[PDB]
Design an enzyme around this catalytic site. Sequence first.
Site, mmCIF file in Angstrom:
data_model
loop_
_atom_site.group_PDB
_atom_site.id
_atom_site.type_symbol
_atom_site.label_atom_id
_atom_site.label_comp_id
_atom_site.label_asym_id
_atom_site.label_seq_id
_atom_site.Cartn_x
_atom_site.Cartn_y
_atom_site.Cartn_z
ATOM 1 N N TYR A 509 0.923 -1.120 0.000
ATOM 2 C CA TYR A 509 0.000 0.000 0.000
ATOM 3 C C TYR A 509 0.979 1.188 0.000
ATOM 4 C CZ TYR A 509 -3.089 3.579 2.109
ATOM 5 O OH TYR A 509 -3.705 4.753 2.434
ATOM 6 N N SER A 592 -4.949 0.155 -5.870
ATOM 7 C CA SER A 592 -5.032 1.608 -5.753
ATOM 8 C C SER A 592 -3.659 2.263 -5.575
ATOM 9 C CB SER A 592 -5.951 1.964 -4.576
ATOM 10 O OG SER A 592 -6.406 3.299 -4.653
ATOM 11 N N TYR A 593 -3.426 2.935 -4.445
ATOM 12 C CA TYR A 593 -2.114 3.555 -4.233
ATOM 13 C C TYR A 593 -1.081 2.434 -4.234
ATOM 14 C CZ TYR A 593 1.434 6.880 -2.683
ATOM 15 O OH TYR A 593 2.540 7.695 -2.671
ATOM 16 N N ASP A 670 -14.907 2.333 -12.468
ATOM 17 C CA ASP A 670 -14.209 2.906 -11.319
ATOM 18 C C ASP A 670 -14.417 4.430 -11.325
ATOM 19 O OD1 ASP A 670 -12.161 3.694 -9.332
ATOM 20 O OD2 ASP A 670 -11.289 1.709 -9.706
ATOM 21 N N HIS A 702 -14.021 0.718 -8.035
ATOM 22 C CA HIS A 702 -12.805 0.626 -7.256
ATOM 23 C C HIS A 702 -12.657 -0.610 -6.385
ATOM 24 C CE1 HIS A 702 -9.050 2.337 -6.192
ATOM 25 N NE2 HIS A 702 -9.315 2.275 -4.899
HETATM 26 C C1 LIG Z 1 -6.023 6.135 -5.226
HETATM 27 C C2 LIG Z 1 -5.779 6.119 -3.776
HETATM 28 C C3 LIG Z 1 -5.557 6.143 -2.628
HETATM 29 C C4 LIG Z 1 -5.195 6.281 -1.216
HETATM 30 N N1 LIG Z 1 -5.928 5.460 -0.159
HETATM 31 C C5 LIG Z 1 -6.843 5.924 0.783
HETATM 32 N N2 LIG Z 1 -7.376 7.159 0.969
HETATM 33 C C6 LIG Z 1 -7.362 7.809 2.242
HETATM 34 C C7 LIG Z 1 -8.889 7.920 2.579
HETATM 35 C C8 LIG Z 1 -9.768 8.420 1.336
HETATM 36 C C9 LIG Z 1 -9.287 7.864 -0.065
HETATM 37 N N3 LIG Z 1 -9.893 8.614 -1.171
HETATM 38 C C10 LIG Z 1 -7.759 7.972 -0.155
HETATM 39 N N4 LIG Z 1 -7.214 4.972 1.558
HETATM 40 C C11 LIG Z 1 -6.665 3.853 1.246
HETATM 41 C C12 LIG Z 1 -5.851 4.065 0.119
HETATM 42 C C13 LIG Z 1 -5.197 2.932 -0.434
HETATM 43 O O1 LIG Z 1 -4.505 3.065 -1.421
HETATM 44 N N5 LIG Z 1 -5.367 1.684 0.148
HETATM 45 C C14 LIG Z 1 -4.698 0.491 -0.448
HETATM 46 C C15 LIG Z 1 -5.781 -0.507 -0.838
HETATM 47 N N6 LIG Z 1 -5.609 -1.812 -0.557
HETATM 48 C C16 LIG Z 1 -6.533 -2.744 -0.858
HETATM 49 C C17 LIG Z 1 -6.288 -4.197 -0.523
HETATM 50 C C18 LIG Z 1 -7.746 -2.318 -1.501
HETATM 51 C C19 LIG Z 1 -8.806 -3.218 -1.868
HETATM 52 C C20 LIG Z 1 -9.943 -2.708 -2.491
HETATM 53 C C21 LIG Z 1 -10.067 -1.303 -2.769
HETATM 54 C C22 LIG Z 1 -9.057 -0.401 -2.424
HETATM 55 C C23 LIG Z 1 -7.882 -0.878 -1.788
HETATM 56 N N7 LIG Z 1 -6.881 -0.044 -1.436
HETATM 57 C C24 LIG Z 1 -6.147 1.535 1.280
HETATM 58 O O2 LIG Z 1 -6.273 0.442 1.805
HETATM 59 N N8 LIG Z 1 -6.778 2.595 1.821
HETATM 60 C C25 LIG Z 1 -7.596 2.444 3.041
#
Ligand SMILES: CC#CCn1c(N2CCC[C@@H](N)C2)nc2c1c(=O)n(Cc1nc(C)c3ccccc3n1)c(=O)n2C
Lengths: 728, 728
Positions: A509, A592-593, A670, A702
């Site tokens: 992440y 995502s990130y 998404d 997403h």
């Molecule tokens: C682009 C971007 C982005 C940034 N980001 C944010 N925020 C902060 C709060 C508000 C939000 N707008 C932006 N929250 C996150 C993430 C993120 O990348 N992952 C990794 C991840 N990991 C897994 C395993 C995931 C699985 C499904 C969906 C998303 C996922 N994401 C997270 O887990 N969380 C909780």
Amino acid sequence: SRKTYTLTDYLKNTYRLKLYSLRWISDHEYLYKQENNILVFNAEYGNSSVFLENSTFDEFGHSINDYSISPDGQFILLEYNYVKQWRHSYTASYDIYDLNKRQLITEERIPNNTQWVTWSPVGHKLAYVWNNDIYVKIEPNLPSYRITWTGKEDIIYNGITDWVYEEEVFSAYSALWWSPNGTFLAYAQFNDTEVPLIEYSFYSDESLQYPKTVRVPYPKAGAVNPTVKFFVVNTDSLSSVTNATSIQITAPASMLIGDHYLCDVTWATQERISLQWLRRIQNYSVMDICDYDESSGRWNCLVARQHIEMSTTGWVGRFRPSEPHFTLDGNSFYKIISNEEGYRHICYFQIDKKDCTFITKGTWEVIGIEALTSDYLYYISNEYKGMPGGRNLYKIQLSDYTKVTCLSCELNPERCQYYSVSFSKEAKYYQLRCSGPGLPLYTLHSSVNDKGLRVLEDNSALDKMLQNVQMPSKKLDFIILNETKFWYQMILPPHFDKSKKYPLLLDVYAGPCSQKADTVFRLNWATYLASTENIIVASFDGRGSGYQGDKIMHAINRRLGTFEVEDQIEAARQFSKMGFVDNKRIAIWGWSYGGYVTSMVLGSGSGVFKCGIAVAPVSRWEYYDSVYTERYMGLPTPEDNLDHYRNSTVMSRAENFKQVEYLLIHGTADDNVHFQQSAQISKALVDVGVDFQAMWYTDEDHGIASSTAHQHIYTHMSHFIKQCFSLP
Amino acid sequence: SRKTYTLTDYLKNTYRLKLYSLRWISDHEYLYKQENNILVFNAEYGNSSVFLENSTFDEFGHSINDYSISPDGQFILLEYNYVKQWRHSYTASYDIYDLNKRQLITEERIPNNTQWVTWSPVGHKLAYVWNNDIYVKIEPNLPSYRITWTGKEDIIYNGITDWVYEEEVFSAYSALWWSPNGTFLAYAQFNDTEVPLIEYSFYSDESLQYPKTVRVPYPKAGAVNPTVKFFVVNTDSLSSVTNATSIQITAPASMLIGDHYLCDVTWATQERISLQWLRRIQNYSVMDICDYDESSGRWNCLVARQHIEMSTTGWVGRFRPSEPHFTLDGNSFYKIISNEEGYRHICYFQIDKKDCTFITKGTWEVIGIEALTSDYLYYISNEYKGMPGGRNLYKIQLSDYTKVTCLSCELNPERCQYYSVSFSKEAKYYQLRCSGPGLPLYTLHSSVNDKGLRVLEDNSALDKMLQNVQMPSKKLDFIILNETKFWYQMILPPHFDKSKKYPLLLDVYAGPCSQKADTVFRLNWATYLASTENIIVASFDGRGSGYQGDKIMHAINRRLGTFEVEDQIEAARQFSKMGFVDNKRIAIWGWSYGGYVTSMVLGSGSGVFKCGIAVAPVSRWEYYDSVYTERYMGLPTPEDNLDHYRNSTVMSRAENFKQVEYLLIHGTADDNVHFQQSAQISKALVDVGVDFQAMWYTDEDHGIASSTAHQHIYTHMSHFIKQCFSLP
Ligand SMILES: CC#CCn1c(N2CCC[C@@H](N)C2)nc2c1c(=O)n(Cc1nc(C)c3ccccc3n1)c(=O)n2C
Ligand SMILES: CC#CCn1c(N2CCC[C@@H](N)C2)nc2c1c(=O)n(Cc1nc(C)c3ccccc3n1)c(=O)n2C
Ligand SMILES: CC(=O)N[C@@H]1[C@@H](O)[C@H](O)[C@@H](CO)O[C@@H]1O
Ligand SMILES: CC(=O)N[C@@H]1[C@@H](O)[C@H](O)[C@@H](CO)O[C@@H]1O
Ligand SMILES: CC(=O)N[C@@H]1[C@@H](O)[C@H](O)[C@@H](CO)O[C@@H]1O
Ligand SMILES: CC(=O)N[C@@H]1[C@@H](O)[C@H](O)[C@@H](CO)O[C@@H]1O
Ligand SMILES: CC(=O)N[C@@H]1[C@@H](O)[C@H](O)[C@@H](CO)O[C@@H]1O
Ligand SMILES: CC(=O)N[C@@H]1[C@@H](O)[C@H](O)[C@@H](CO)O[C@H]1O
Ligand SMILES: CC(=O)N[C@@H]1[C@@H](O)[C@H](O)[C@@H](CO)O[C@H]1O
Ligand SMILES: CC(=O)N[C@@H]1[C@@H](O)[C@H](O)[C@@H](CO)O[C@H]1O
């Protein structure tokens, strides 16, 4: 003679973690849902009474999605016809039920497609948002009053948030804030009139001949942002044929000079509201204190009374300025703030006084203030044994700050290390929730002397079940980088023989303030890869990660795709040196990130990785939204940070991809991280002649969380990793 | 030879096929470009002088895309800024170079972004379309005259075609027809006001922050169709004062009772136009012969002299009612017609007498009429040796229908069996084009006594190169199912061994009137597969295929996704039998309609194929355009053929994909077969729990033809087939 935690087990939820979700109804009682039979519990003694039996409503008509009992207990909102919109927003049909006389109100029903509904804090008033306009009901059967008339789809939003604010500011669709009295109703008004629209095709069912185009006001980095206004309506002075009067509360002069956001709304007392505004350049934020002057009937926000919270090293707060917790009388409050050493601690503020006072200090951080009484302040932090990935509930004697008591540290040292709490109103009781390293454990506690009242749920049914499966174990340690500790967790295959070579998947992440190395127990995909495929799944928190101080969290300020990317590689490297990881079989993946970082790593050319999987990843920061992106990257202008925006795209690293096996996945619907982002990536790869695996998901967003899609992506991904590691 | 035909050879175009494109300018001369020089040749003696030198536009400023020399060779239209649109449409800028001088007519320059330009058949008159409106210039340096003012983007098309007409009717962007004289100018008008729009995202360059949404008026099966009107204007009478008066020519009354299209526009004489209309139910068409009344300046089409075309077994024509070839005086004409036994032969029509006279008959078909002199009608058929896949030029003595001569059959038997021809105007000369089975051969001939004048290009170079490489051979045989003979081809590996077992790939098209088995010579992906991977690539023309009579072609009528699919599976069963085919490794692949058939095949649970690749496949006929779809399926309504529309989807067969490895590919910017069609396929597979491989191509259209995209897809597919066939 034991089986392994299989993909199907995870995919079909074979092992259910039980929970215990209650809702404090008072200082001594709480509601709990059991077998669709809503119950009322006495905290002190543990006895209960059924409040509503499943039986009731078996002849309702539609399926009930959720319940909401009024503070009075005289009425209960029935939500059905739920249609999900974004991460928190959705629409639905509603029905009220008079408990005093077992009947569904049939007159003056809440309209269909209502966007949001909320009871008042006390009594049984109602406030709802239908068609972007605020309506209020003093009584459930009586006709409602219309508060705002400006509401207009995709343009004007009253009482509800637009896309960004829902996602990046309030983590909620609501923009309604009832006073503790129920007297006033404060609300925000969003105006996306000049906010560009992202558009994408939704295909829908086969039956649909022509695909549909969804258009959402979504401000990408640098685009025009929605604007905001704030109002407050007196609920007791609403007449039959007399438009209601909302009194607007302007933002400070320091905010109006440019673009700004409304970050928080908190009622201090019956006649004092706390507001926090943040500049579009999330460097500076200002808390505003407004009192109600019975005279004019207006709200004054005395300029001297203000409180500034700026930052020199980075942005303000973790994701937004922290929330204030007022003392009963409202002339003071507590707030979590970054101290001079860069660590986040509790500061005491007295309203008509300047600078604040820190109550805590140390090389650790307060995660959040949970409760406040006259004698104690309850918070959660990661102080215990210096583990940043640990969580514990502490007490602070307000008349002697040096007197801090840990309330959960020694309850179950071996089993419990990650806690979240839930206090009853006025904090006479509190429920502790431990989610690891062992099976989750819920307990009820007395506040008067911190006595354990009873175990609410100990997941023993899961324990019995799991003693038959070969479960993976978790290692929580750290490595050193330039004389600094950086934590990592490893999910190890059962019967881990450190004299053998295991392939390693790096689960990442690594986003600003993230934390993948912690002590919570999880039954997920990694559990499977370790249990059955005997793969080591590690996660590393490097620079950028949070809850370790601003020096570490701000190391990435104004430079995403930098140090956090490098550190992922360095961690991976040191894992190699370890005599139990096949350095020829090291993979990486992230959503995502975590997906952007995964791409950046694969395109670094380090040669450390054999393959990587990126799911719905960001590729270029201009494609993501203003609030999140700008918080760390500033603006994409030549005067500001345009160079680094352009210097950190995944595309510019396309060539290096020829050294790795890359799998790219993304949902076509998404709304958060637009398909566009992955679209641009694949094109970059095609333009330099690099081969890679791809996979889109029709109409998934997403989360790619639809049962069918969910099992599909994880099945696909498992094959990819199995083949990349030459595993059977 | 050691060296084989590599993939890189195919993708990098290593062994080029020379050609000889010439444009006849008169009875005995033609233009041809050597390097970047336009030479003019004399067909009789073969002498050639340089007409225009590559050194004439160096200081032009723009990169010239194409040239267009006016009839009287006095001017030369220069085309630059070429920007492609759909398959035949595009926009560009122009400049007229006066040859009688050393200048570029810079006065009254043709406006930029012009959509279509064309000289008159004689002289130097100039008509062009701009902003959907028609303009005419009598002189290149003079102010053009506006002919229509109704032009309106995506709504009113004057002189150019809308999307459906461009693609499924006229196969061109133009809707202008000059009369021989050069006097009249007939044009068509399309009204797309009520046509639904297909919409898709186009992401473009990395720098585009928000993706762009493209909207094209496009009717799908059963949707509202664009309407049409026809006009003719006298361009000799054009005053810059008063506006040009257009005369409308309504369609036959037996066409106005419902939807209809314009199918063909051909002038007979100076004062006679031939218009063939088609009913939206494509099995009834009426040709109209209209004469210009010189006294009323009108055009009258006596309803008495109309001709009717009908099909009881299917629709009209191969893809539309064939084109008429009027005798010089305009009182008669020949037209290819399906006779009694169902084969297509030449029919002779005399304008004011009923029926026509077949001047050909047999168990073979006339592929097309190419020329028509006073004593001979020239045409190409597949009669020779009863080979549908072969093509030859023939001559029929108009004064004795029984005397037919073959002008190419014996030219070079072992090397040439597939010809195409280009006659000089008046037809004193003809260039014959040999396409295979040997390397392409171009020769010039005089028709006086069919004397071979000279060889134009024989590919001696390419030829000498290939002897050095280990090339594959082609087998053109046939198998018998019931009592009917169906042809197939097989690109066999070098040093083929009837005792060795090779895997087989089934190259598929199989659409209505398609022909995949023939004598043509090709250098493509199939060549690479047989040459280097030793993969046998076979194609098969089963039921529905064309050039063999309506019994075979119409078998598929209103029943797509049936026989054409069965026959492909069958063919593969037979090839399995043949002792040199490994029944453990049989693949199938197709693009467009072939993509569709390949998917149905893979979803039949036959157990014959191990894997398959579908590119930009149709998935459900309700998603493709009306004119092509309705031509074989009728309307998708319950009173018509809705039942078979719903029983022939790729989706309903999802479950069966569990038995095969599948690769689905599609360009996101596909305007022809909308990305939607594949999106629904993937969703069906995911919804049913079937794992497959996927791959989209951002911003590519139906042809996935950009240089880089093209290379990427054939590489991707190659890895797929190589891994599906356990190939080293
Ligand atoms: C682009 C971007 C982005 C940034 N980001 C944010 N925020 C902060 C709060 C508000 C939000 N707008 C932006 N929250 C996150 C993430 C993120 O990348 N992952 C990794 C991840 N990991 C897994 C395993 C995931 C699985 C499904 C969906 C998303 C996922 N994401 C997270 O887990 N969380 C909780
Ligand atoms: C949907 C659909 C469709 C039907 N279709 C048509 N027509 C008839 C005339 C009018 C037109 N609208 C529809 N022409 C076709 C096809 C077709 O499927 N293939 C296979 C194929 N194979 C390969 C290898 C291809 C490669 C690139 C593009 C297309 C390709 N197509 C063809 O080769 N040709 C020439
Ligand atoms: C939730 C519940 O049932 N509470 C009951 C309370 O109403 C009752 O007065 C008391 C004495 O019997 O026992 C429990 O505390
Ligand atoms: C208050 C209101 O709008 N009621 C109607 C309800 O009568 C109707 O049955 C339903 C259709 O689903 O639409 C609404 O819910
Ligand atoms: C309710 C409201 O304040 N609407 C305003 C609108 O009048 C103004 O023209 C526009 C310009 O950005 O900004 C908002 O949308
Ligand atoms: C130039 C032309 O033919 N315009 C017609 C218009 O007259 C008609 O009202 C409409 C109905 O579909 O279709 C087009 O817009
Ligand atoms: C000379 C003359 O009458 N020109 C008119 C033009 O101004 C008008 O816009 C058009 C549409 O009715 O009809 C004619 O072309
Ligand atoms: C449909 C449903 O919820 N049925 C439950 C039943 O399983 C349970 O045994 C019973 C005990 O009170 O309560 C009912 O509500
Ligand atoms: C195409 C060409 O160059 N034709 C010329 C012709 O103009 C000339 O009359 C003839 C006699 O010298 O020689 C030919 O080569
Ligand atoms: C006839 C005419 O308009 N020519 C201009 C040309 O001079 C100019 O260079 C170009 C764009 O710069 O646009 C064209 O339309």
